[PDB]
């Protein structure tokens, strides 16, 4: 068995529904700890189950990948999002990721974070605060959910698209020649870019970046519409080359099986990653000196390793859970009792039944 639509709204099955803050830690652990107990129990057993007159035995492998970056930082015991310690796979600082930018290796795991929290709590070498935080590499809490280090694909799309949006807004103002600017000059650059994007690419402007905006934005037509507003031409060829590199490197971490359908784009990832990084460090040093986004570090440093280990990225993305969130509001308004003591049960039952595949072979039985 191999699931055809791994990011569908029809294959994600709901398991636990609660009404609590994502960032409130205590009630979150209070609800989720029985689930972790059952998972670490059944990670070492053999389920015997009768399947059409014969008993058969199943073993299990759980892969936690449908988590956004903020929740991995929260429940894996790592620091917050804006720290010096960026990547949830490797041990590197933010200034080091802007000096090397390609060559890393995956080092963080779950047992390592557990032992590092033990090191932080015991303080077994008697160091100061800052030397201890250097020793434990930013772990300051107890990790209570085992996960696989990977990259969420959907939020990588949205983060890289917003970063390119800021690059476009910073190139029409020539900030490499006006390194100081007011508030209102930047506001006017944003308004000019919004008007020209609506005039050219038929895009209405939004303050929260979506995924459809991210797919419609990362084209060459948008860099032509933006290059219409730059006075120079060296900035034209730089934006042209950079968007070409990003489109050469996008469909490796977005395809469901990059080893088969786009193999030559998969193979050229390290070469194109070094080209993207040297272009960022040369022709865009007014934006990437002393800093980088952590999604650029993930996208440029760790994608071939995740591809080699787990076979695919984007099959394991959080797209299916977000489409489940689309279903959840519909099921809460349309298919539930309107009482606070009954709504979670009815919604959980309906969202279970909707994803049930026995009720889905019926609706395409006309294709027999």
């Amino acid at each position: 068995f191999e699931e055809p639509k791994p990011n569908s709204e029809l294959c994600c099955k709901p398991l636990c529904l609660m009404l609590a803050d994502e960032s409130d830690h205590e009630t979150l652990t209070a609800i989720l700890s029985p689930l972790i107990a059952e998972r670490e129990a059944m990670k070492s057993s053999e389920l015997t189950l009768e399947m059409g007159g014969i008993p058969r035995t199943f073993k299990f492998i759980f892969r936690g990948t449908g988590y956004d970056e903020k929740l991995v930082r929260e429940v894996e015991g790592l620091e917050a999002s804006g720290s010096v310690y960026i990547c949830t796979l490797c041990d590197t600082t933010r200034l080091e990721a802007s000096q090397n930018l390609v060559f890393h290796s995956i080092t963080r795991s779950h047992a390592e974070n557990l032992q590092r929290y033990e090191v932080w709590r015991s303080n077994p070498y008697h160091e100061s605060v800052e030397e201890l935080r250097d020793r434990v590499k930013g772990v300051s809490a107890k990790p209570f959910i085992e996960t696989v280090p990977s990259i969420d694909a959907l939020h990588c799309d949205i983060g890289n698209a917003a970063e390119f949006y800021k690059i476009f807004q910073l190139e029409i103002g020539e900030v490499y020649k006006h390194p100081n600017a007011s508030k209102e000059e930047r506001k006017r650059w944003q308004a000019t870019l919004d008007k020209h994007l609506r005039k050219r690419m038929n895009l209405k402007p939004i303050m929260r970046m979506n995924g459809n905006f991210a797919r419609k934005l990362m084209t060459q037509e948008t860099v032509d519409a933006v290059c219409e507003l730059i006075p120079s031409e060296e900035r034209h060829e730089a934006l042209r080359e950079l968007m070409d590199l990003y489109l050469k490197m996008k469909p490796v971490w977005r395809s469901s099986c990059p080893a088969k359908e786009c193999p030559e784009s998969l193979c050229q990832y390290s070469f194109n990653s070094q080209r993207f990084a040297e272009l960022l460090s040369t022709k865009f040093k007014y934006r990437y000196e002393g800093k980088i986004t952590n999604y650029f570090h993930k996208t440029l440093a760790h994608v071939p390793e995740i591809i080699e280990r787990d076979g695919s990225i984007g099959a394991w993305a959080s797209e299916g859970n977000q489409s489940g969130n689309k279903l959840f509001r519909r099921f809460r308004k349309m298919n539930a009792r309107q009482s606070k003591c009954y709504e979670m049960e009815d919604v959980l039952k309906h969202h279970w039944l909707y994803t049930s595949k026995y009720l889905q072979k019926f609706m395409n039985a006309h294709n027999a």
Partner: protein, 160 residues
Amino acid sequence: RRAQKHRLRELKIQVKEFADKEEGGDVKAVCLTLFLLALRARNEHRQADELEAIMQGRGSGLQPAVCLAIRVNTFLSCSQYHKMYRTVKAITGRQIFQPLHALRNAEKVLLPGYHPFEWQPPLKNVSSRTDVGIIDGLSGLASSVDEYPVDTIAKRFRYD
């Protein structure tokens, strides 16, 4: 029923003698298939298949499983399904769909806590009881005023 005899008394006998000397004696069959041919040259295949439905076994009545699959896959509510079923049954006579409680009693095959199973090492700190479905997600948190205050609502399956 009566007063159409003086107009069809003539045609019936050349139906009778032809079907006797040609087919073997059937009359209902040979006026059945002639009306099939008349409907299909008429190009009214829907009434032809409904006559086939009256001849062979009726397709009245769906299974409760397929009405469940329909009601949950087209985002129908239970009240909308109820008045659709009520109108269809009160207009067309026969009961094409199924009532709500049949869908209820046939949805329990698909919710968890219906099938038997076991784990060959029995799992630590969870019961081997096999009929638990929608359980409370708090897992019996201390909801007294003398404790850390809780204010959330949580419902969950068992993971196994």
